[PDB]
Ligand binder design. Structure first.
Ligand SMILES: Cn1cnc(N)c2ncnc1-2
Ligand SMILES: [Zn+2]
Length: 188
C-alpha cells in the first residue's frame, strides 16, 4: 500500500522505524540536525540503508556527533578511524565530517543556533511537498542548491545540492511523505 510506496519498498524494521520516527519528522535540535547532515554526507556511492546501519559505529567514531569535540579531531584521529570497524573507510568522507563540525561552530557564532540558521531556509515551518506518488519525487531544488552553496563558505564538505535536498527531507524541513502514507506528519 501507501507505506510501501513511500518508504522505498522496504520491509526492514530498521528502515521502517527510521521512516516512521525520523524521516520527514520536523527536527529542531541543533546538534541532532548536525548529526543527520553529517550522515547524509557519507552516502555517495553507497545505499542509504547501508549508512543507516552504520549509525552506531559513526556515533562511537565521532563522539556522538558533538560538534565541539568533532571539530577538534586531528589527522592522527582520522588515521585511527581508517581502520575503525563499520564506518565508511573513505578518507575524504571522514575528513569532511570534521570540516562540517568546524562550519557548524562558525554558523553558531554568527547566528546563535544552527537550527535557527537552517529553519530560516523554509521560513521556520516544514514545507509540505504534497506528493501523491513516489514518481512525483524530485531529487534537488533551488532552496537545497542555495543551502549547499551557503554551507561551503563556512567550510562544509561533501554536501552538494542533491545531498542537501536529501537532508532537508530527512530532517523534516521538507515533508516528502506521500499523501496516504500512514507516517506522514500532520501540519499546521
Ligand atoms: C533513499 N533515502 C532515504 N532516506 C534518506 N535519508 C536518504 N538519503 C539519501 N537517500 C536517502
Ligand atoms: Zn512515508
Amino acid at each position: 500500500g501507501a507505506m510501501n510506496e513511500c518508504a522505498f519498498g522496504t520491509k526492514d524494521p530498521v528502515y521502517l522505524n527510521y521512516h516512521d520516527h525520523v524521516w520527514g519528522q520536523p527536527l529542531y535540535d541543533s546538534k541532532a540536525l548536525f548529526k543527520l547532515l553529517a550522515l547524509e554526507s557519507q552516502h555517495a556511492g553507497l545505499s542509504w540503508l547501508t549508512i543507516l546501519k552504520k549509525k552506531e559505529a559513526y556515533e562511537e567514531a565521532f563522539y556522538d556527533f558533538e560538534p565541539e569535540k568533532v571539530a577538534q579531531m586531528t589527522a592522527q584521529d582520522i588515521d585511527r578511524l581508517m581502520t575503525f570497524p563499520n564506518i565508511v573507510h573513505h578518507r575524504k568522507k571522514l575528513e569532511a565530517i570534521v570540516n562540517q563540525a568546524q562550519g557548524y561552530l562558525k554558523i553558531e557564532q554568527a547566528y546563535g543556533s544552527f537550527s535557527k540558521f537552517l529553519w530560516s531556509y523554509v521560513n521556520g515551518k516544514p514545507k509540505d511537498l504534497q506528493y501523491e506518488h513516489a514518481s512525483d519525487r524530485i531529487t534537488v531544488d533551488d532552496t537545497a542548491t542555495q543551502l549547499s552553496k551557503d554551507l561551503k563558505q563556512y567550510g562544509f564538505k561533501f554536501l552538494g545540492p542533491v545531498t542537501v535536498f536529501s537532508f532537508l527531507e530527512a530532517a523534516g524541513l521538507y515533508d516528502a511523505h506521500l499523501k496516504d502514507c500512514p507516517s506522514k506528519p500532520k501540519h499546521n
